[PDB]
């Protein structure tokens, strides 16, 4: 009687695939099915970007065809949808936050195109980042063998539950040296499900600026922790400000979970959708501050200026324009009142909508800068 992974893999290999993409290059890679009925496969953006055609090949041989659904080069998750899908198998999600260093992991992919290959390992570490400076990364690190083409693959725990998506490895020679990274499930869950509802990743930000907290700062500012998130300035009029986070604060926990580094938290919340609420654990003057927040963005308006009605049927008013915006480049200034556009007397923003919804190549606005009568031109 010998233990084996073949019972767990028998149920899980159907949910991983191989993907092929096609001056013009032809790409290898791996993806994983999220929704059997609709045929959603997730993978890394760096295999399915610049894709003329997307050809998915399941575990059994069946090639299919897929189209793009969303993309997110900042975290490197991209979603495709299989066309005309029949008899698909969806992998079961796992909650990454239950991962611990020392756990066992299985990496399924399509390395070097050879075919669906399985490789075992353990959780080398968690919360790794700093390899791509301008990138959201909260990587799971595994010593499970992973090579070219295994990207967008599956990292599942011993129960076949998806804990993460294999992404990048550190390897000077171009072959795995025992250091393989993966994006956690919980981030993939947040990024994929956003691409289905909205098509893109809408990831507004709360308004903290700041930098990593090093053990040297612990001494200088009487801070009990050596790893966290230090708040330089809070943006004004942002959620971070409204919630009462101040300069000189230290962030220690996200939703009760501790933080590894500012670069990780910067990624965990970079994948959360707009308006998500959360609770941070702060540290001001060595005392625990718990906050509650809500993310914020980065008709009844226009590209650069804000238009509201005024009076009965008289016309819409530009109430403020920010300098440098497109609507300030076209010349609209504070106080202008639009009575007609393209020989069409306008009242409300609704008669202006249908006129604007014609999407004409030119806009002649019969505004009233002060007491005078002028025309303004846009597009």
């Amino acid at each position: 009687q010998m233990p084996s992974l073949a019972p767990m893999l028998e149920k899980v290999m159907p949910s991983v695939v191989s993907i092929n993409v096609e001056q013009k290059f032809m790409a290898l890679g791996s993806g994983v099915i999220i929704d059997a009925d609709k045929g959603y496969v997730v993978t890394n953006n760096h295999v399915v970007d610049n894709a003329t055609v997307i050809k998915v090949q399941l575990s059994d041989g069946r090639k299919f065809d897929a189209k793009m659904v969303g993309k997110d080069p900042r975290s490197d998750i991209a979603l495709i949808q299989i066309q005309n899908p029949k008899n698909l198998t969806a992998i079961k999600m796992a909650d990454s936050d239950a991962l611990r260093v020392g756990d066992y992991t299985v990496a399924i992919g399509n390395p070097f195109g050879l075919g669906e290959t399985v490789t075992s390992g353990i959780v080398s570490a968690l919360g790794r980042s700093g390899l791509n400076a301008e990138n959201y990364e909260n990587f799971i690190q595994t010593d499970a063998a992973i090579n070219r083409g295994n990207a967008g693959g599956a990292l599942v725990n011993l129960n076949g539950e998806l804990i993460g998506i294999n992404t990048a490895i550190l390897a000077p020679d171009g072959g795995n040296i025992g250091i393989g990274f993966a994006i956690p499930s919980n981030m993939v869950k947040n990024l994929t499900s956003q691409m289905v509802e909205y098509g893109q990743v809408k990831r507004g930000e709360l308004g903290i600026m700041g930098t990593e907290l090093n053990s040297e700062l612990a001494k200088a500012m009487k801070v009990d922790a050596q790893r966290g998130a230090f708040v330089s300035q809070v943006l004004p009029n942002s959620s971070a400000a409204k919630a009462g986070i101040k300069a000189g604060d230290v962030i220690t926990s996200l939703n009760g979970k501790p933080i590894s580094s500012f670069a990780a938290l910067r990624a965990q919340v970079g994948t959360m959708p707009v308006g998500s609420k959360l609770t941070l654990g702060l540290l001001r003057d060595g005392k625990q501050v718990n906050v509650n927040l809500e993310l914020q963005q980065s008709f009844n308006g226009i590209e650069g200026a804000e238009m509201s009605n005024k009076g009965k049927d008289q016309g819409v008013v530009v109430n403020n324009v920010k300098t440098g915006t497109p609507a300030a480049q076209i010349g609209l200034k504070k106080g202008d009142v639009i009575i007609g556009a393209n020989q069409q007397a306008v009242k409300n923003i609704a008669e202006l909508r249908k006129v604007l919804d014609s999407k004409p190549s030119v806009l002649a606005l019969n505004i009233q800068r002060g007491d005078s009568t002028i025309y303004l031109l846009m597009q």
């Binding site: 760096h46 090579n147 070219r148 295994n150 992404t167 990048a168 490895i169 390897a171």
Partner: peptide, 5 residues
């Protein structure tokens, strides 16, 4: 010392 996959 910089690589990607």
């Amino acid at each position: 010392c910089y690589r990607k996959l």
